[PDB]
Design an enzyme around this catalytic site. Structure first.
Site, short mmCIF file in Angstrom:
data_model
loop_
_atom_site.label_atom_id
_atom_site.label_comp_id
_atom_site.label_asym_id
_atom_site.label_seq_id
_atom_site.Cartn_x
_atom_site.Cartn_y
_atom_site.Cartn_z
N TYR A 132 9.10 -1.26 -3.42
CA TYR A 132 8.38 -1.79 -4.59
C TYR A 132 7.86 -0.66 -5.47
O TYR A 132 7.70 0.49 -5.04
CB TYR A 132 7.16 -2.64 -4.15
N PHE A 142 0.91 2.73 -10.39
CA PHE A 142 -0.10 3.11 -9.48
C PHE A 142 0.39 3.32 -8.08
O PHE A 142 -0.25 4.03 -7.30
CB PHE A 142 -1.26 2.13 -9.49
N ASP A 143 1.57 2.80 -7.71
CA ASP A 143 2.13 3.06 -6.41
C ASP A 143 3.61 2.74 -6.41
O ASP A 143 4.04 1.93 -7.21
CB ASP A 143 1.38 2.34 -5.32
N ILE A 192 -1.82 -8.62 -0.37
CA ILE A 192 -2.44 -9.53 -1.31
C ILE A 192 -1.70 -10.88 -1.33
O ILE A 192 -0.52 -11.00 -1.00
CB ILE A 192 -2.50 -8.92 -2.74
N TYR A 233 -6.63 -8.30 -6.12
CA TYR A 233 -7.84 -7.67 -5.64
C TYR A 233 -9.08 -8.18 -6.35
O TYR A 233 -10.20 -7.65 -6.11
CB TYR A 233 -7.73 -6.16 -5.69
N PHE A 253 4.61 -6.04 -10.28
CA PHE A 253 5.45 -5.40 -9.29
C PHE A 253 6.90 -5.70 -9.53
O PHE A 253 7.29 -6.80 -9.91
CB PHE A 253 5.15 -5.92 -7.87
C1 LIG Z 1 -1.88 4.38 3.46
O1 LIG Z 1 -2.41 3.78 2.24
C2 LIG Z 1 -2.18 2.44 2.13
C3 LIG Z 1 -3.11 1.51 2.60
C4 LIG Z 1 -2.86 0.14 2.47
C5 LIG Z 1 -1.67 -0.32 1.87
O2 LIG Z 1 -1.37 -1.62 1.71
C6 LIG Z 1 -2.54 -2.26 1.36
C7 LIG Z 1 -2.05 -3.62 1.04
O3 LIG Z 1 -1.46 -3.54 -0.25
C8 LIG Z 1 -1.10 -4.65 -0.82
O4 LIG Z 1 -1.36 -5.75 -0.42
C9 LIG Z 1 -0.29 -4.47 -2.01
C10 LIG Z 1 0.95 -5.29 -1.91
C11 LIG Z 1 1.96 -4.66 -0.92
C12 LIG Z 1 2.32 -3.23 -1.26
C13 LIG Z 1 1.06 -2.40 -1.42
N1 LIG Z 1 0.17 -3.11 -2.37
S1 LIG Z 1 -0.47 -2.29 -3.60
O5 LIG Z 1 0.60 -1.63 -4.29
O6 LIG Z 1 -1.23 -3.20 -4.35
C14 LIG Z 1 -1.46 -1.02 -2.96
C15 LIG Z 1 -2.73 -1.35 -2.55
C16 LIG Z 1 -3.58 -0.35 -2.03
C17 LIG Z 1 -3.08 0.91 -1.98
N2 LIG Z 1 -3.75 1.99 -1.53
C18 LIG Z 1 -3.06 3.15 -1.54
O7 LIG Z 1 -3.52 4.23 -1.18
S2 LIG Z 1 -1.54 2.89 -2.13
C19 LIG Z 1 -1.79 1.21 -2.37
C20 LIG Z 1 -0.98 0.25 -2.83
C21 LIG Z 1 -0.74 0.59 1.39
C22 LIG Z 1 -0.98 1.97 1.54
O8 LIG Z 1 -0.07 2.88 1.06
C23 LIG Z 1 1.27 2.47 1.33
#
Ligand SMILES: COc1ccc(OCCOC(=O)[C@@H]2CCCCN2S(=O)(=O)c2ccc3[nH]c(=O)sc3c2)cc1OC
Length: 128
Positions: free
Chosen positions: A45, A55-56, A75, A101, A118
């Site tokens: 993604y 952002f990611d 989420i 969030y 996304f």
């Molecule tokens: C090791 O840092 C993390 C910690 C948690 C993580 O997933 C948190 C849950 O995220 C989400 O529910 C959503 C949807 C699935 C893909 C990840 N997301 S996100 O893009 O909104 C998101 C959400 C939090 C986040 N924190 C970071 O340091 S990178 C990151 C990315 C993802 C991470 O990086 C992969």
């Protein structure tokens, strides 16, 4: 751009029909089967904010993002959205904050009250 297009032309995939999660299928995946609750799902993604910031991205990490579907490990918009995908599908999702969030955000990248975009590719899904 793509966020505007899913906002204006996407399909509401929520049970409530509240337009909180909108989807466009960009590439049709394989067959008819979608993952089941509890399956280990592998995705790639990229996420963007409404200010245009990427952002990611899992692509930039050279490894997929892996989670168990329908367990609140992600989420709400992802539990709902990935459940609609076929293996090999690529989709765009537009996620209002109530399915993301919310007012809390997720610091440091995601502000309060953020609508998220996304692009998601479903690589594989398997039962444990
Ligand atoms: C090791 O840092 C993390 C910690 C948690 C993580 O997933 C948190 C849950 O995220 C989400 O529910 C959503 C949807 C699935 C893909 C990840 N997301 S996100 O893009 O909104 C998101 C959400 C939090 C986040 N924190 C970071 O340091 S990178 C990151 C990315 C993802 C991470 O990086 C992969």
């Amino acid at each position: 751009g793509a966020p505007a297009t899913v906002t204006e032309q996407g399909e509401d995939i929520t049970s409530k029909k509240d337009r909180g999660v909108l989807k466009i299928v960009k590439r049709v995946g394989n067959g008819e089967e979608t993952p089941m609750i509890g399956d280990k799902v592998y995705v790639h993604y990229k996420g963007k904010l409404s200010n245009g910031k990427k952002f990611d991205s899992s692509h930039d990490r050279n490894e997929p993002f892996v989670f168990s579907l329908g367990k609140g490990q992600v989420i709400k918009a992802w539990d709902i959205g990935v459940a609609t995908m076929k293996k090999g599908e690529i989709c765009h999702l537009l996620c209002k904050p109530e399915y993301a969030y919310g007012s809390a955000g997720s610091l440091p990248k995601i502000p309060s009250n953020a609508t998220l975009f996304f692009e998601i590719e479903l690589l594989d899904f398997k039962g444990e």
